[PDB]
Amino acid sequence: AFVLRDVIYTLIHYINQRSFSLCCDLLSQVCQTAVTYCKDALENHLHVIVGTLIPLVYEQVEVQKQVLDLLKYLVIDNKDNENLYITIKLLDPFPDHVVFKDLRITQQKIKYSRGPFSLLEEINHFLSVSVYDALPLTRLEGLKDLRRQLELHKDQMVDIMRASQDNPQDGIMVKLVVNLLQLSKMAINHTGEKEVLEAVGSCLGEVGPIDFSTIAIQHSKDASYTKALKLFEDKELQWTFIMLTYLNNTLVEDCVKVRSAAVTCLKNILATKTGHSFWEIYKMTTDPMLAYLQPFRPFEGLDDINLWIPLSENHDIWIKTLTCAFLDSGGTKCEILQLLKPMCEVKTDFCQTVLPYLIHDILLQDTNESWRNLLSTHVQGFFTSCLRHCCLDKKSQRTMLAVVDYMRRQKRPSSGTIFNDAFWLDLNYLEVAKVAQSCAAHFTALLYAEIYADKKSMDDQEKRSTTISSLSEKSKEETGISLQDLLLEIYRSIGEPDSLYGCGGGKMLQPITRLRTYEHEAMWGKALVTYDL
Amino acid sequence: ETAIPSSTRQAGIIQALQNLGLCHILSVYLKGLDYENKDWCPELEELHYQAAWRNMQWDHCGTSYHESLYNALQSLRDREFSTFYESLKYARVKEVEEMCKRSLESVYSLYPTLSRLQAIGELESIGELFSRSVTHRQLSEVYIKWQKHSQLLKDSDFSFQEPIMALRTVILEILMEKEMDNSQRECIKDILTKHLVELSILARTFKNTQLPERAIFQIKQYNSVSCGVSEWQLEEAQVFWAKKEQSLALSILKQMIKKLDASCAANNPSLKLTYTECLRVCGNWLAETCLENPAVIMQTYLEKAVEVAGNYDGESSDELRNGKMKA
Ligand SMILES: [Zn+2]
Numbered sequence: 075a076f077v078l079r080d081v082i083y084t085l086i087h088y089i090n091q092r093s094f095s096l097c098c099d100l101l102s103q104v105c106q107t108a109v110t111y112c113k114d115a116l117e118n119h120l121h122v123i124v125g126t127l128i129p130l131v132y133e134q135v136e137v138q139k140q141v142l143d144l145l146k147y148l149v150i151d152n153k154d155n156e157n158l159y160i161t162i163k164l165l166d167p168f169p170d171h172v173v174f175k176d177l178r179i180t181q182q183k184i185k186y187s188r189g190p191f192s193l194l195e196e197i198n199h200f201l202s203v204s205v206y207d208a209l210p211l212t213r214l215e216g217l218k219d220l221r222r223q224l225e226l227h228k229d230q231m232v233d234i235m236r237a238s239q240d241n242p243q244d245g246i247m248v249k250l251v252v253n254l255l256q257l258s259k260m261a262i263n264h265t266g267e268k269e270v271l272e273a274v275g276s277c278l279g280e281v282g283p284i285d286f287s288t289i290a291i292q293h294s295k296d297a298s299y300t301k302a303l304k305l306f307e308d309k310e311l312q313w314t315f316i317m318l319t320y321l322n323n324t325l326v327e328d329c330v331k332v333r334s335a336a337v338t339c340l341k342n343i344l345a346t347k348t349g350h351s352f353w354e355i356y357k358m359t360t361d362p363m364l365a366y367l368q369p370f371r372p373f374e375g376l377d378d379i380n381l382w383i384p385l386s387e388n389h390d391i392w393i394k395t396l397t398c399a400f401l402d403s404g405g406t407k408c409e410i411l412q413l414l415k416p417m418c419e420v421k422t423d424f425c426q427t428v429l430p431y432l433i434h435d436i437l438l439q440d441t442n443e444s445w446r447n448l449l450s451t452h453v454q455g456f457f458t459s460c461l462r463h464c465c466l467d468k469k470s471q472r473t474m475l476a477v478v479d480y481m482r483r484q485k486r487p488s489s490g491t492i493f494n495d496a497f498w499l500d501l502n503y504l505e506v507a508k509v510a511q512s513c514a515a516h517f518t519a520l521l522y523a524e525i526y527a528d529k530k531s532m533d534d535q536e537k538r539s540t541t542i543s544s545l546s547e548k549s550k551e552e553t554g555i556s557l558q559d560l561l562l563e564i565y566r567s568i569g570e571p572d573s574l575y576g577c578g579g580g581k582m583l584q585p586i587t588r589l590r591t592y593e594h595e596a597m598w599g600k601a602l603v604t605y606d607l
Numbered sequence: 608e609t610a611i612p613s614s615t616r617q618a619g620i621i622q623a624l625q626n627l628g629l630c631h632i633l634s635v636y637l638k639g640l641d642y643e644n645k646d647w648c649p650e651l652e653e654l655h656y657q658a659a660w661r662n663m664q665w666d667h668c669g670t671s672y673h674e675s676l677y678n679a680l681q682s683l684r685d686r687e688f689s690t691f692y693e694s695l696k697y698a699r700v701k702e703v704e705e706m707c708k709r710s711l712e713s714v715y716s717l718y719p720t721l722s723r724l725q726a727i728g729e730l731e732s733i734g735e736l737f738s739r740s741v742t743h744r745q746l747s748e749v750y751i752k753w754q755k756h757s758q759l760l761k762d763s764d765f766s767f768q769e770p771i772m773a774l775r776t777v778i779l780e781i782l783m784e785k786e787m788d789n790s791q792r793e794c795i796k797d798i799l800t801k802h803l804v805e806l807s808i809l810a811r812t813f814k815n816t817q818l819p820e821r822a823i824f825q826i827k828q829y830n831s832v833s834c835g836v837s838e839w840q841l842e843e844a845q846v847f848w849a850k851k852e853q854s855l856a857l858s859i860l861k862q863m864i865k866k867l868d869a870s871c872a873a874n875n876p877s878l879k880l881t882y883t884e885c886l887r888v889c890g891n892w893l894a895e896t897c898l899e900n901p902a903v904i905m906q907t908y909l910e911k912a913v914e915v916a917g918n919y920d921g922e923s924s925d926e927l928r929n930g931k932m933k934a
Contacts, residue, residue, distance in 0.1 A: 581858040588855075600850070603817055606629050607824055 076366040078108060079119050079326070086126055087328040090265075098140045102147070113157045118362070121203075124148065125166055125212030131173075142173070149180050159184070164203050166216040193230035196223045197246055204253050205296065210261035210270050217254075217273040224280045235284070242287045252291055254278060289570065290517070302359065310408070313431060314352045317410055318343065322366060324421060335417035337370075342413045344370045372404040373448060382452050383459045385466045392470065393425040394418075397432070405436035405445060426473050430480035437498065438487065450500035457505045460512075461555070471513050478506060479518065496525050503529070507564075508555055516568045523561055542577065559586070566590055614648065621654045628817025630662045661773055663780065672698050672723055676730070676774075683734060684781060691734055695727055702727075722767040726774045729753070733778050741782070743794050750798050757805065765813040772806045776825070783829070800826055804842045811849050819846045834870050836863050838881045841888070853896060860889050879919055880930050886912035887934045909934070
């Protein structure tokens with residue numbers, strides 16, 4: 075190591091913020107001691123170091139000499155290590171300068187030891203290093219070589235997709251497309267974004283809009299996190315694990331305030347019985363997180379119409395004041411769900427990611443639906459405020475949609491099914507569906523529309539103890555938004571071949587529907603006439 | 608194609624847009640022509656005034672026939688009959704002298720002149736009617752005269768009949784625009800709807816679907832739906848059927864049947880005859896497209912229309928006997 079990673083990340087932060095010779099000497103000494111006194115100290119936190127000093131070659135002669143000295147030290151004096159063989163084999167190439175001939179030859183010997191990699195092998199290697207490193211800036215050379223591989227080997231993309239027709243849901247090309255999209259989303263708010271965005275855009279420009287025969291996007295996740303949550307049988311343990319992991323991720327940033335609050339939170343949770351039980355359970359898995367964390371061993375304040383929607387370019391303030399208002403109240407019970415205030419006060423993403431957790435924590439201890447009715451009314455008021463004609467930023471809508479999605483997957487303490495699970499709060503999902511429509515979340519909007527229609531049908535059935543047009547007119551009368559039009563918009567923007575006809579396509583007299591059908595069927599001759607008429 | 612000279616290329620483009628039902632697009636395109644080209648040739652100026660009076664573009668400011676017609680229409684809208692009559696007399700003189708100066712020898716050349724003169728005469732009759740006041744009997748006798756002459760024009764070409772129908776539509780729209788709120792407004796609106804539906808069938812029989820859709824759009828613009836559907840819903844279904852939208856036409860006609868058989872109450876013999884017509888049309892459409900076996904469609908529509916027509920034939924009117932014969 076923890077101290078080794080803390081010092082190496084602090085030093086690389088000082089290098090990246092541009093004593094430079096002193097910093098290079100210190101990082102050379104620490105890596106020399108790591109590779110001398112250990113065989114796996116640099117097995118994971120090495121790829122950043124390596125991929126960071128490469129753009130520093132175009133600097134002073136002393137900097138260039140030190141950069142080449144460290145590179146030749148790492149690629150020659152440590153290439154014989156059995157544990158480091160995989161690490162040296164899995165890293166970005168250096169096509170930058172001619173003076174790197176020794177680096178190129180020593181890299182290609184290990185890289186092409188088994189032979190010349192094909193296009194599919196290059197894609198697999200790129201995805202393997204893509205998931206191995208969380209910093210897209212250091213992967214610019216990998217993107218450049220991926221671009222060259224795709225451009226030169228365009229012939230090899232035909233048989234790969236021909237062989238992938240049997241299992242289109244595991245497409246390699248679509249997996250690379252979503253991987254680049256995820257990398258761009260990671261580097262959307264980081265330094266040097268104009269270069270990484272251009273590189274990923276050029277990589278996606280080397281491949282056309284090939285029909286992948288798939289509509290759904292699957293976000294690949296690391297297997298360690300999934301297996302840890304799979305073997306965590308308690309929601310308390312799951313919450314502790316996700317919080318501690320996020321604290322570790324937010325502990326390695328350049329800002330000193332965030333890491334000071336993170337280390338204080340580490341001692342706060344690790345000093346409690348929840349932390350002790352977590353380590354009891356967590357003591358069998360093979361995760362270096364143990365080594366990293368080893369040294370570290372009411373309703374009056376929530377009812378406010380302005381508090382829920384103070385949204386005039388103040389999303390950060392709105393989430394911060396919501397988290398503070400929820401934590402200071404007596405609804406929160408867990409120590410980890412109570413002692414996170416000092417750190418979440420300065421971290422914007424922490425408030426977004428912990429708001430659904432604190433909402434679920436409060437609702438678990440709710441009695442007689444006291445918190446349930448108030449939260450449901452306030453959330454519905456928020457969605458009505460968003461639907462007002464009011465021009466709220468998309469970050470707030472996507473935050474609440476993420477909260478709703480998380481709360482939909484939480485099991486009700488009482489006996490029930492997934493249908494009851496989706497109604498954790500007293501909400502009508504048509505408004506949420508239209509919000510997701512405005513947020514380009516068509517799949518969630520369609521699911522919410524189906525849920526709302528099911529709820530309306532159940533309510534009508536119990537009232538008695540119902541066509542699409544009847545539901546649309548009922549929604550228009552009560553809510554003010556037509557379900558038939560919302561479904562038509564979803565089924566049009568989703569791109570599915572034959573889905574608009576079910577909602578009234580080809581059988582609806584309204585000109586809006588007639589125009590949509592005309593555009594869908596490419597009947598532009600009559601579409602232009604109808605548009606003018 | 609750009610090799611065609613702009614003298615007739617623009618005229619062909621404008622004529623195609625006019626026959627394609629595009630009015631606002633043509634108006635904007637002609638405005639772009641005015642922007643890019645300053646001077647106006649007589650042909651494009653005449654087409655400009657034709658589109659101006661046809662689209663009721665009153666904002667736009669010897670004279671050609673279309674220019675005289677637009678000036679007369681504006682004078683009528685301004686309650687000025689002296690210039691209206693002078694313009695019509697000048698247009699008649701110009702058309703007659705232009706027609707007679709050529710070598711003639713062809714009957715087909717007489718048709719455009721006869722159509723223009725007929726349009727001028729109809730505008731003269733409208734001016735005489737709108738000189739001091741309008742009455743229901745005068746509007747009825749004008750409409751029946753127009754219908755009788757259109758019956759005399761059944762064998763005429765659609766090219767020679769379209770300007771007459773367009774002028775009649777413009778006249779009816781002007782009458783609706785300058786009608787005070789009274790029982791006469793309802794009569795004028797009904798006459799306008801009847802004129803638009805007869806224009807719909809007239810254009811439908813000539814393999815045209817844009818103008819009938821425009822007529823239905825104007826019908827929906829003025830008339831409004833209610834519990835008892837009128838005959839223009841049936842005409843809309845026929846137009847959509849001609850537009851190869853069989854599913855939409857069938858759905859509309861089935862909805863009309865569902866409304867009629869549920870809220871008929873023998874309110875009107877006109878509703879009875881249009882119910883029989885709707886049932887006959889639905890039966891014919893089902894028989895032709897074969898979406899259902901004949902066993903159920905025959906009993907549901909054909910014998911139903913026959914018994915409906917035969918159960919209330921106590922008037923023996925021509926408009927009922929012809930419908931019974933068709934069923
Ligand atoms: Zn607004």
